[PDB]
Design a binder for this molecule. Structure first.
Ligand SMILES: C[C@H](C[C@H]1O[C@@H](n2cnc3c(N)ncnc32)[C@H](O)[C@@H]1O)NC(=O)c1cc(-c2ccc(F)cc2)cc(O)c1O
Ligand SMILES: [Cl-]
Ligand SMILES: [Cl-]
Ligand SMILES: [Mg+2]
Length: 213
């Protein structure tokens, strides 16, 4: 089996069904003590929590679900009736994410789509009945942050106030995306310095609020 399968099994055997916080704790324990994995982690995850609570978004889009850690993290703080859509290109990881959400009891709040963000984004309006997004969490391939931001705008999915929150802007790094949003009058940016998940290595989140054209 794979690392991701081991993580899922660990959660199933060390967390409480229907208890998202126990799921996050289980994943953090496994990744600290057993095998590292690219979940956003507790350090950055606390910042994410603070952002989600500030904005109380009704519709969030996540790019790059992996095992569902961040989807659990965000969805557990959404208000009743609010929704998360998350995309994952790797079919094995999409199935793990689905099962992780099911175990957490969040499956009614979250739709996990198996596919590439650049193919699925242009379908959101006609196929998934999306008007505009309140928040976007970018955590997929780092060289796709910029192209998919531009794609989101082209598709009419951003509104005044939409919050983009980007993981890994320092490690592995997303230098084109950071230069772009920081230099654009269409975004208001804030940098939240933190640490790479499960590691004593500096990383950060960037928040970029869309201001319109
Ligand atoms: C990119 C991955 C996260 C997931 O993104 C999905 N994905 C891809 N492209 C697409 C698409 N176009 N559409 C949808 N899903 C998509 C994929 O299949 C992964 O499951 N994340 C990382 O590689 C990542 C790596 C590190 C990292 C840091 C220090 C190191 F020494 C080594 C690795 C830390 C992090 O925090 C990460 O987030
Ligand atoms: Cl994650
Ligand atoms: Cl951490
Ligand atoms: Mg990441």
């Amino acid at each position: 089996d794979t690392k991701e399968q081991r993580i899922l099994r660990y959660v199933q055997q060390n967390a409480k069904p229907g208890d998202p916080q126990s799921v996050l704790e289980a994943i953090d324990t496994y990744c600290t003590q057993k095998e590292w994995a690219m979940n956003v982690g507790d350090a950055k995850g606390q910042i994410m929590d603070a952002v989600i609570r500030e904005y109380s978004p009704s519709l969030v889009l996540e790019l790059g679900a992996y095992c569902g850690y961040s989807a659990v993290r965000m969805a557990r703080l959404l208000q009743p009736g609010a929704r998360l859509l998350t995309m994952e290109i790797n079919p094995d990881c999409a199935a793990i994410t689905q099962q992780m959400l099911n175990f957490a009891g969040l499956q009614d709040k979250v739709t996990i789509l198996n596919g590439a963000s650049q193919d699925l984004i242009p379908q959101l309006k006609k196929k998934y009945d999306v008007d505009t997004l309140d928040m976007v969490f970018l955590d997929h391939w780092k060289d796709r942050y910029l192209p998919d931001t531009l794609l989101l705008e082209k598709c009419g999915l951003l509104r005044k106030g939409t919050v983009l929150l980007a993981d890994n802007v320092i490690v592995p790094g997303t230098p084109d995306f950071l230069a772009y949003v920081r230099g654009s009058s269409s975004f208001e940016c804030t940098h939240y310095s933190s640490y790479l998940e499960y590691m004593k290595v500096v990383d950060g989140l960037e928040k970029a609020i869309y201001q319109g054209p």
